[PDB]
RNA sequence: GAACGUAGAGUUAAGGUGCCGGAAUACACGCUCAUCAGA
RNA sequence: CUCCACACAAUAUAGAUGGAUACGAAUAAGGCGUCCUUGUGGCGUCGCUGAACCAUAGCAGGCUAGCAACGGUGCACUUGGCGGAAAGGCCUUGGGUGCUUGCUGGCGAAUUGCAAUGGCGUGGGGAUAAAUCAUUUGUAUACGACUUAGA
């Protein structure tokens, strides 16, 4: 579904004579808090040898976008498993918000790579601030000055049975 | 081919030669009656053959040709289902040969074949001329109705034979006026 | 003559919470998505897929990535509300809204006035 | 003067069915000019008549009527379920059936 | 809403139009399908040619579309037979249907369903390529029809232009303003 | 998928929702035009 | 085609109860109007659905009264033209004769009691153009069939 950002902190349990461990913080994109916590443990075990019984979650939080009006540009690091071998991948995404970019990224990774939501491990999403750091050509296609183009798919849903008009993609 | 017998003893013409509309309006076939065979002496004019400029003797077949007379016409219009005659047009005076052809019991019939059709020239011809102008207007191809002078022939059958002939001259209107 | 997706292209969201509200493309996202704002019509600034919206032949000049207070300024200075209302298509939309707004005694008066107008036209007809 | 219709004609589509088992009790109706179930909410509970014409003249007329009513919507296209007093003969699939406005909420 | 629905076949897809019509006949709507020779098939000519070939081991386009349509309806039932008896299919537009409006089915349009840059197939060329020797007869009648229809439309446009003039001079009257008040 | 008295009403599992065939020719994003894809 | 006898009829059958209401092509283009330099010209318009248009008051549509126009409209005629793809329809002349809700009148409606829809077949005679059987032929032929010819 439509995901959400989550500040998730874990601190694996202060034992006897070990007070206050190091409060490991991550940021998870998930549809709810529950799968966010599950993914947080799923990364924390890959960080080092914890279990969900070994530690605990400090604070689950949703964090919104500060400026969800501006179209930002993003460079994303992803790791995932082409089942036998892993490899990283760096993608550049023009999007208004972060979590919608991560949504579209999951859709694209499932489109081109047949990879599930569990197989995809987000490394980093960060805004590309200035122009020309867009290494990808296709996002750079929309960085031109005074960009104009016509609509493709003038075909629409006609919603009726018979048409008297002999219609036309008149665009 | 499966060898089943002929439908009519007058054999059908399934295909006619190509229409040239630059030639004058003229027939494309004829119906005669074969008399017999004989032998003809002629000279061969065939260079490339050893028999060039040499007397050859040749078997021929002669068909009696009575002059044929036209008594009607038939125009076919094109349909997407094929050729179809929209009408046929007859003349007024038809012989007892032809009126015999429509009848099976001519010897005892009251011979009532084309009586009310003769009333169609009792008028000016308005229905008939309407039909002629219709075949001018419609009916892309024209066939004429012809029969032979079988009484001028040693055939014992006094009943002449009717046939259609596709008319491969020019100008459908000039064809039907012809 | 083509419409183009561009900044300052005033648009009309035929399907959604707007279901017809005049907005304007502030910025493009890709071939599929854009950024719009309709603060005069009341629809807020948002990202949208282009299927949910239609382009209008009207346009004006709008700055790249312009904020909402700047957007409403350039909207009013464009005065494309009046240019929209002057268009026969928006007149037809308001007309098909008004036809749904009709009452049965109103519709009966429509019947009577159509009779009377038809009488006058058929007198005006068959003399010219 | 020209029209006297106080109903909406609509097609008797079918019986309620799976791929293998059909229910003759519930019948399926297409009301003309209705594509949404929300428009079909207006037509809920309305009194339906199938009008047909018999050979014989039962009580002063040869025309007979089955009655019944809309129960609920069916599907996304505004197809409408209906229950009658006696069920339909099923040779009336695609037949015009009259749907009356009473019981009127408006 | 109409008793007999007249459907043009030009620029349409085989199966989608067949599905729509097959649904409407089982709904009871009487349908005549005209200009059948201008139906269009997805894919190239050659694929569809091989499909008619390995099916064949009737050549008219009407027979083809009737085949496709009859496959969708449960033809063996009496109800399906009544539905097929509702149907008429014609290549070209013969009379009387030439003088009536021909609707289109947008969800079966070629220009809407097909992505641009795809090969399609004209049904009349297919039928002539498999032995339907009547396509030249069709276009000859259709040319005359388009002549007479252009005449009709030229007359109709002038008369409706006169109607437009009469409505223009009928305007500014108070009865027109009262119609404006009511919305017309 | 579900241990099944006889019914009525509702909700669903699986399975589907172009037509047969009941139910979106829904929506969204990418990929494939195959001279017998693919489902 | 025609004279006696009797069975429905003035109807409807896959589904009547306002109207099936006509350019063609193109779609990375069209249309309409207009102007000229008639063009692949220019200008403007339009689409973004028929949710349109046309018809639509009157006892399931009564009886009358005028006002105004030379309209509209039905029917039977009548004039002429168009229509062959399966034309079987379209359009027009001219009157007739109805209605007219374009406007304004005047009488009737009830109790139906609060919804229950509310020419074609037979049976028996009469007349008729042909066809068949029969005769006959042999270009045909196991036989049919073919095929002459006969008031």
Swiss-Prot record, chain A:
> Which Gene Ontology terms describe the biological processes this protein takes part in?
cytoplasmic translation
Q: What is its main location?
A: cytoplasm
Pfam families cross-referenced by the UniProt entry: Ribosomal_L18A
Q: Which UniProt keywords apply?
A: Cytoplasm, Isopeptide bond, Phosphoprotein, Ribonucleoprotein, Ribosomal protein, Ubl conjugation
State the signal peptide span.
none
Judging by the UniProt lineage, the source's domain of life is Eukaryota
Q: Where is this cross-link: Glycyl lysine isopeptide (Lys-Gly) (interchain with G-Cter in ubiquitin)?
A: 124, 130, 148
Ribosomal protein listed as a keyword: yes
User: Matching InterPro entries, A to Z?
Assistant: Ribosomal_eL20, Ribosomal_eL20_dom, Ribosomal_eL20_eukaryotes
Q: Which GO terms describe its molecular function?
A: structural constituent of ribosome
Residue(s) carrying Phosphoserine:
31
Q: What's in the GO CC field?
A: cytosol; cytosolic large ribosomal subunit
Localization annotation: Cytoplasm
How does the annotation summarize its subunit structure?
A: Component of the large ribosomal subunit (LSU). Mature yeast ribosomes consist of a small (40S) and a large (60S) subunit. The 40S small subunit contains 1 molecule of ribosomal RNA (18S rRNA) and 33 different proteins (encoded by 57 genes). The large 60S subunit contains 3 rRNA molecules (25S, 5.8S and 5S rRNA) and 46 different proteins (encoded by 81 genes). eL20 forms multiple interactions with RNA and proteins in the central protuberance, connecting components of core functional centers that are located far apart.
Family, similarity comment = Belongs to the eukaryotic ribosomal protein eL20 family.
Additional free-text comment from the UniProt record: Present with 54300 molecules/cell in log phase SD medium.
Task: Specify the protein name.
Answer: Large ribosomal subunit protein eL20A
List the source organism.
Answer: Saccharomyces cerevisiae (strain ATCC 204508 / S288c) (Baker's yeast)
Swiss-Prot record, chain B:
Q: What is this protein called?
A: Large ribosomal subunit protein uL3
Q: Which UniProt keywords are present, listed alphabetically? A: Cytoplasm, Isopeptide bond, Methylation, Phosphoprotein, Ribonucleoprotein, Ribosomal protein, Ubl conjugation
Q: What happens when the gene is disrupted?
A: A mutant confers resistance to trichodermin, a trichotecene toxin produced by plant-pathogenic fungi.
Q: What does this protein do?
A: Component of the ribosome, a large ribonucleoprotein complex responsible for the synthesis of proteins in the cell. The small ribosomal subunit (SSU) binds messenger RNAs (mRNAs) and translates the encoded message by selecting cognate aminoacyl-transfer RNA (tRNA) molecules. The large subunit (LSU) contains the ribosomal catalytic site termed the peptidyl transferase center (PTC), which catalyzes the formation of peptide bonds, thereby polymerizing the amino acids delivered by tRNAs into a polypeptide chain.
Q: Does the keyword Ubl conjugation apply?
A: yes
> Crosslink site(s) for Glycyl lysine isopeptide (Lys-Gly) (interchain with G-Cter in ubiquitin)?
23, 120
Q: Which residues in this protein are found as Phosphothreonine?
A: 87
Spell out the subcellular localization from the entry: Cytoplasm
Quote additional remarks.
Present with 450 molecules/cell in log phase SD medium.
Organismal lineage:
Eukaryota, Fungi, Dikarya, Ascomycota, Saccharomycotina
From Swiss-Prot, chain C:
Enumerate the Gene Ontology biological process terms.
cytoplasmic translation; macroautophagy; maturation of LSU-rRNA; ribosomal large subunit assembly; ribosomal large subunit biogenesis
Output a single Gene Ontology CC term carried by this record. cytosol
Q: Which SUPFAM superfamilies match?
A: Translation proteins SH3-like domain
What does the UniProt entry say about where the protein is found? Cytoplasm
Record-annotated membrane-spanning stretches: none
Description of post-translational modifications: N-terminally acetylated by acetyltransferase NatA.
Which keywords does UniProt give here?
Acetylation, Cytoplasm, Ribonucleoprotein, Ribosomal protein
Listed GO MF terms: RNA binding; structural constituent of ribosome
Coiled-coil regions listed in the entry:
none
CDD domains reported for this sequence: eL14
* InterPro entries documented for this protein: KOW, Rib_uL2_dom2, Ribosomal_eL14, Ribosomal_eL14_dom, Translation_prot_SH3-like_sf
Does Cytoplasm count among this protein's keywords?
Answer: yes
- Please indicate if the UniProt record lists Lyase as a keyword: no
Name the protein family. Belongs to the eukaryotic ribosomal protein eL14 family.
The miscellaneous remark of the record is: Present with 45300 molecules/cell in log phase SD medium.
Per the entry, what this protein does is: Component of the ribosome, a large ribonucleoprotein complex responsible for the synthesis of proteins in the cell. The small ribosomal subunit (SSU) binds messenger RNAs (mRNAs) and translates the encoded message by selecting cognate aminoacyl-transfer RNA (tRNA) molecules. The large subunit (LSU) contains the ribosomal catalytic site termed the peptidyl transferase center (PTC), which catalyzes the formation of peptide bonds, thereby polymerizing the amino acids delivered by tRNAs into a polypeptide chain.
PANTHER family hit by this protein: 60S RIBOSOMAL PROTEIN L14 (PTHR11127), LARGE RIBOSOMAL SUBUNIT PROTEIN EL14 (PTHR11127:SF2)
> What's the name of the protein?
Large ribosomal subunit protein eL14A
Q: Report which gene this protein is encoded by.
A: RPL14A
Curated annotation (Swiss-Prot), chain D:
**Record's function text:** Component of the ribosome, a large ribonucleoprotein complex responsible for the synthesis of proteins in the cell. The small ribosomal subunit (SSU) binds messenger RNAs (mRNAs) and translates the encoded message by selecting cognate aminoacyl-transfer RNA (tRNA) molecules. The large subunit (LSU) contains the ribosomal catalytic site termed the peptidyl transferase center (PTC), which catalyzes the formation of peptide bonds, thereby polymerizing the amino acids delivered by tRNAs into a polypeptide chain.
Q: How does it assemble?
A: Component of the large ribosomal subunit (LSU). Mature yeast ribosomes consist of a small (40S) and a large (60S) subunit. The 40S small subunit contains 1 molecule of ribosomal RNA (18S rRNA) and 33 different proteins (encoded by 57 genes). The large 60S subunit contains 3 rRNA molecules (25S, 5.8S and 5S rRNA) and 46 different proteins (encoded by 81 genes).
State where it is primarily located: cytoplasm
**Keyword presence, Endoplasmic reticulum:** no
Listed GO molecular functions? structural constituent of ribosome
Q: Does the keyword Cell inner membrane apply?
A: no
Query: Could you tell me where this protein is found in the cell?
Result: Cytoplasm
In-chain residues carrying the UniProt-annotated modification N-acetylalanine: 1
User: InterPro entries, per this entry?
Assistant: Ribosomal_eL33, Ribosomal_eL33_CS, Ribosomal_eL33_sf, Transl_B-barrel_sf
Q: How is the protein modified post-translationally, according to the record?
A: N-terminally acetylated by acetyltransferase NatA.
* Gene encoding the protein: RPL33A
Native organism is Saccharomyces cerevisiae (strain ATCC 204508 / S288c)
- Which family, according to the similarity comment? Belongs to the eukaryotic ribosomal protein eL33 family.
The protein depicted here goes by the name Large ribosomal subunit protein eL33A
What's the miscellaneous note?
There are 2 genes for eL33 in yeast.
May I ask which residue range the UniProt record assigns to the signal sequence?
none
